[PDB]
Amino acid sequence: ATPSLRGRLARFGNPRKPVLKPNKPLILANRVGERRREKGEATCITEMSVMMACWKQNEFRDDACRKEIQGFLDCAARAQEARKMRSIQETLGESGSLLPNKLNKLLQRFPNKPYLS
Amino acid sequence: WLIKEELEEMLVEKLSDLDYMQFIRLLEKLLTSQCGAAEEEFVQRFRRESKKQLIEPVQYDE
Amino acid sequence: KNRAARVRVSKGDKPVTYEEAHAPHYIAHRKGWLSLHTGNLDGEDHAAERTVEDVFLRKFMWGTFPGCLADQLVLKRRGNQLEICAVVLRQLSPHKYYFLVGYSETLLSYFYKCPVRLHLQTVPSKVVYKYL
Amino acid sequence: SRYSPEFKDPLIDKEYYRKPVEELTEEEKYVRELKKTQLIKAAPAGKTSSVFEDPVISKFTNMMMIGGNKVLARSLMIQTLEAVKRKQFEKYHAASAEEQATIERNPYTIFHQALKNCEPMIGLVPILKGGRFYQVPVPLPDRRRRFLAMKWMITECRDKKHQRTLMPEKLSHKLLEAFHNQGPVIKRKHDLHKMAEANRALAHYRWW
RNA sequence: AUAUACCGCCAUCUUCAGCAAACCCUGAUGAAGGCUACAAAGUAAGCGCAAGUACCCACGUAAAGACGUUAGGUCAAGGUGUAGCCC
RNA sequence: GAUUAACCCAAGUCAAUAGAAGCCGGCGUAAAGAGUGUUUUAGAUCACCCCCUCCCCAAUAAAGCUAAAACUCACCUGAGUUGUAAAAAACUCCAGUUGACACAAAAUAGACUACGAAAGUGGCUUUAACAUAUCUGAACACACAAUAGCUAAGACCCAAACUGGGAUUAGAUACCCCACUAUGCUUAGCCCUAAACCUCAACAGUUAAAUCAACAAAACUGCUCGCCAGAACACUACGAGCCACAGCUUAAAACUCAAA
Ligand SMILES: CN[C@@H]1[C@H](O[C@H]2[C@H](O[C@H]3[C@H](O)[C@@H](O)[C@H](NC(=N)N)[C@@H](O)[C@@H]3NC(=N)N)O[C@@H](C)[C@]2(O)C=O)O[C@@H](CO)[C@H](O)[C@H]1O
Numbered sequence: 001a002t003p004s005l006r007g008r009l010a011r012f013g014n015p016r017k018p019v020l021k022p023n024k025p026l027i028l029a030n031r032v033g034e035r036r037r038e039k040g041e042a043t044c045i046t047e048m049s050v051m052m053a054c055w056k057q058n059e060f061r062d063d064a065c066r067k068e069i070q071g072f073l074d075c076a077a078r079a080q081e082a083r084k085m086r087s088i089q090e091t092l093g094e095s096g097s098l099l100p101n102k103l104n105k106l107l108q109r110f111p112n113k114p115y116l117s
Numbered sequence: 118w119l120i121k122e123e124l125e126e127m128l129v130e131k132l133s134d135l136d137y138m139q140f141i142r143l144l145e146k147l148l149t150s151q152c153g154a155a156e157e158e159f160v161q162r163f164r165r166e167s168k169k170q171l172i173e174p175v176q177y178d179e
Numbered sequence: 180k181n182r183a184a185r186v187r188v189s190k191g192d193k194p195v196t197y198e199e200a201h202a203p204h205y206i207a208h209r210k211g212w213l214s215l216h217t218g219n220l221d222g223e224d225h226a227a228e229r230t231v232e233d234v235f236l237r238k239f240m241w242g243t244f245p246g247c248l249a250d251q252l253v254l255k256r257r258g259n260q261l262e263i264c265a266v267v268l269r270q271l272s273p274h275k276y277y278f279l280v281g282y283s284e285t286l287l288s289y290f291y292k293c294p295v296r297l298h299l300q301t302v303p304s305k306v307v308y309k310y311l
Numbered sequence: 312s313r314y315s316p317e318f319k320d321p322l323i324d325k326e327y328y329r330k331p332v333e334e335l336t337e338e339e340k341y342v343r344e345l346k347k348t349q350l351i352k353a354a355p356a357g358k359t360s361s362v363f364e365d366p367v368i369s370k371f372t373n374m375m376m377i378g379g380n381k382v383l384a385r386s387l388m389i390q391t392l393e394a395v396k397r398k399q400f401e402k403y404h405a406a407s408a409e410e411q412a413t414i415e416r417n418p419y420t421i422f423h424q425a426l427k428n429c430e431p432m433i434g435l436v437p438i439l440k441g442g443r444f445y446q447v448p449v450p451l452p453d454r455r456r457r458f459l460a461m462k463w464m465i466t467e468c469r470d471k472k473h474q475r476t477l478m479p480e481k482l483s484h485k486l487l488e489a490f491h492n493q494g495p496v497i498k499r500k501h502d503l504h505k506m507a508e509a510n511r512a513l514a515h516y517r518w519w
Numbered sequence: 520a521u522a523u524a525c526c527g528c529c530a531u532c533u534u535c536a537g538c539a540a541a542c543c544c545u546g547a548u549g550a551a552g553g554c555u556a557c558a559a560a561g562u563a564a565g566c567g568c569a570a571g572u573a574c575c576c577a578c579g580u581a582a583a584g585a586c587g588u589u590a591g592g593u594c595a596a597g598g599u600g601u602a603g604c605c606c
Numbered sequence: 607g608a609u610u611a612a613c614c615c616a617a618g619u620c621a622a623u624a625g626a627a628g629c630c631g632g633c634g635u636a637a638a639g640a641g642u643g644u645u646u647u648a649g650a651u652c653a654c655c656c657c658c659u660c661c662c663c664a665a666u667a668a669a670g671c672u673a674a675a676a677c678u679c680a681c682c683u684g685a686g687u688u689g690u691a692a693a694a695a696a697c698u699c700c701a702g703u704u705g706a707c708a709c710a711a712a713a714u715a716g717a718c719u720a721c722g723a724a725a726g727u728g729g730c731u732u733u734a735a736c737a738u739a740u741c742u743g744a745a746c747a748c749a750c751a752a753u754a755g756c757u758a759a760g761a762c763c764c765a766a767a768c769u770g771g772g773a774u775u776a777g778a779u780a781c782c783c784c785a786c787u788a789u790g791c792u793u794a795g796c797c798c799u800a801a802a803c804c805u806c807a808a809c810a811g812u813u814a815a816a817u818c819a820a821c822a823a824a825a826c827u828g829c830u831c832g833c834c835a836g837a838a839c840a841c842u843a844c845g846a847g848c849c850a851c852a853g854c855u856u857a858a859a860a861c862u863c864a865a866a
Pocket residue numbers: 863865
């Protein structure tokens with residue numbers, strides 16, 4: 001249930017004080033905003049913390065911390081593939097919501113008319 | 118597929134890039150369907166060296 | 180930007196000729212040469228003396244046939260001979276053309292010690308290639 | 312480039328083509344037919360189909376060369392391989408009967424392993440966060456760490472601390488010290504490992 | 520003397536694509552503005568780009584590269600308008 | 607400026623000066639709805655007919671109450687806490703857990719849109735209580751009016767002009783950090799201001815016609831009150847009035863420009 005707009009904006013018939021003071025007219029546009037780039041999640045941090053903790057104990061020797069390094073190595077390989085897979089697949093693959101570029105072609109076929117003709 | 122510049126010669130009409138793509142989209146759609154013999158001729162109108170080394174002739178000396 | 184031998188674009192009311200409509204980078208691709216001799220060939224000489232004759236001949240004909248030259252001269256040399264080929268307008272009377280042919284041929288034959296022959300090709304109006 | 316995009320890089324592998332059609336997978340089989348249609352680049356001089364071709368020893372030679380003098384860069388590499396070979400034979404005849412089983416005499420096995428002991432695992436990459444550049448520890452890619460190992464070995468040898476020592480004797484001495492996890496090149500890896508473990512608090516700035 | 524009168528030859532943005540006549544429409548016939556391809560007012564000669572050409576090809580490199588901008592550069596290439604000198 | 611020609615008027619010409627022509631237009635942003643409400647003398651025709659949002663949600667005043675957080679004290683433990691783009695100074699009867707404990711301020715609800723003349727009002731309870739059966743009606747009458755501020759006596763968690771210290775900086779009477787005061791609170795008097803602006807007066811009515819300079823919050827009609835007529839000087843000067851004495855209200859002119 002979309003909030004009401006009766007007696008909200010300052011007008012001539014409305015006797016009471018305004019409830020809303022919009023800086024942009026409350027009229028639907030014929031386009032949507034572009035999806036903003038997020039921040040991302042750092043990967044292989046737990047493997048990277050147990051591998052650098054073994055160096056301190058073993059004075060940065062790569063012969064006693066071999067097992068820890070593989071965890072940090074194998075992870076990097078898997079993480080790298082996911083980044084490549086995610087970027088290409090999301091745009092090409094159609095999942096959930098549509099993209100702005102395809103969604104603005106749908107809103108321009110049914111434009112909002114705040115005028116008379 | 119007939120290129121844009123070659124399609125303006127069959128029609129003697131200037132064509133935009135976008136209009137050419139629209140025409141190609143219908144022809145491809147035509148091919149996917151079970152087109153009859155006559156249709157194949159229609160599409161063919163708009164459609165236009167073996168990578169093998171050349172063996173040298175074996176000769177014979179004296 | 181480059182300016183040499185280029186006619187700048189206009190509204191469309193300026194008529195230019197084939198030679199005047201092509202820039203220097205077309206001189207051997209779409210244009211020929213207005214003078215043809217051997218001076219500039221590999222191992223040939225007297226390229227500076229054939230050049231001075233061309234600069235003077237083009238000025239002698241421009242001032243001797245005033246208002247009558249539709250296009251540039253085409254100078255041709257075959258041995259001793261020098262052949263001047265020109266496109267001219269039909270405004271001037273023929274009587275005056277024959278006078279200028281015998282005056283220019285003779286004067287230039289005694290000046291450059293060579294047989295000079297002039298071949299006119301009259302045209303009604305200046306041939307127009309396109310309108311820039 | 313004088314080659315068009317159509318041109319594809321050639322495959323010098325000699326045992327690939329020999330593969331029987333019966334082993335060819337459906338995907339692989341397709342590829343082989345496709346290549347027929349494709350145009351192929353001319354094989355470069357550097358790489359042949361010999362059994363002694365080593366891509367790592369050819370790349371290490373190219374990283375030392377100066378001004379296209381490949382005859383000298385290759386000469387230094389082979390002298391180094393021969394110096395490693397002669398030094399191990401001298402350590403093998405003078406060793407005990409049970410110490411000779413743990414003495415590597417193949418200079419290649421020493422070259423590839425020594426470079427593997429110098430490859431760093433993590434490096435420092437400048438990331439822009441809050442209008443500032445932070446040297447956050449980042450996992451170096453496989454290629455990067457393979458390149459750094461070669462660059463450091465050549466920089467250490469080129470470094471003008473050894474007054475009058477020929478490169479073959481220097482490169483051979485550093486390769487034998489890194490084989491046993493010793494020397495400056497290994498130490499240089501630890502110093503990069505000590506700076507990535509001190510600045511681990513900034514290991515979340517990165518996204519990838 | 521004046522490049523701040525100019526031609527001429529160039530630089531530069533240009534490792535661009537835009538420049539623009541002539542029409543049309545919108546805005547109540549204001550300066551102004553002018554797109555959406557499952558299309559909603561723009562069409563466009565000419566110019567440049569592109570294509571062609573040159574060099575060892577289809578590649579690449581040259582060349583070409585507008586209309587404008589910076590009163591950009593040069594009166595000392597030469598010519599030249601104006602003012603000035605002429606024992 | 608001289609000269610030549612020409613134009614206008616003409617026994618006149620025309621430099622200076624003065625005068626003659628000035629109210630039915632406006633007030634969202636150009637100069638104008640002066641912070642609010644009431645009434646008077648009076649005016650209006652929206653008063654009879656004739657009709658439709660009583661009550662309740664955050665009006666106001668008084669008294670009482672307290673959930674979260676904080677301060678303080680005490681115990682136990684620890685050796686540091688504060689501060690930040692990063693530091694210094696500061697503090698070290700300091701910090702953390704637990705417990706006890708306000709004359710301060712009132713998460714969510716509130717995506718609600720209410721009360722009141724406006725200012726303003728958003729924790730709980732109770733008492734009193736919210737003008738008017740036509741409309742309009744005041745810089746000055748009558749009564750109100752955020753914050754700041756004065757006077758007097760109390761309170762004090764936190765915040766905090768001034769001030770002091772630390773740092774930055776060419777400098778830094780500033781922005782950043784710390785500490786603390788007037789002050790903000792209560793009681794009793796005063797002061798009487800605001801971008802008190804929803805910059806859009808009160809009442810009644812319409813949505814047709816020429817919709818309408820622009821923008822903003824579509825354009826109009828009737829009626830009444832108030833105000834305004836180039837800019838600046840000027841939220842000034844003088845005068846008057848006022849518990850106001852560096853104050854507020856009201857409020858000119860000269861000089862100056864040809865624009866704002
Ligand atoms: C159309 N005229 C515009 C106007 O010019 C005006 C301008 O007038 C100026 C006054 O002399 C000066 O005393 C006056 N100075 C003052 N202290 N009052 C200026 O404010 C005034 N300029 C102005 N109002 N814009 O200078 C004068 C000489 C002017 O040229 C008179 O006609 O104002 C000029 C800007 O000041 C503009 O450049 C002009 O285009």
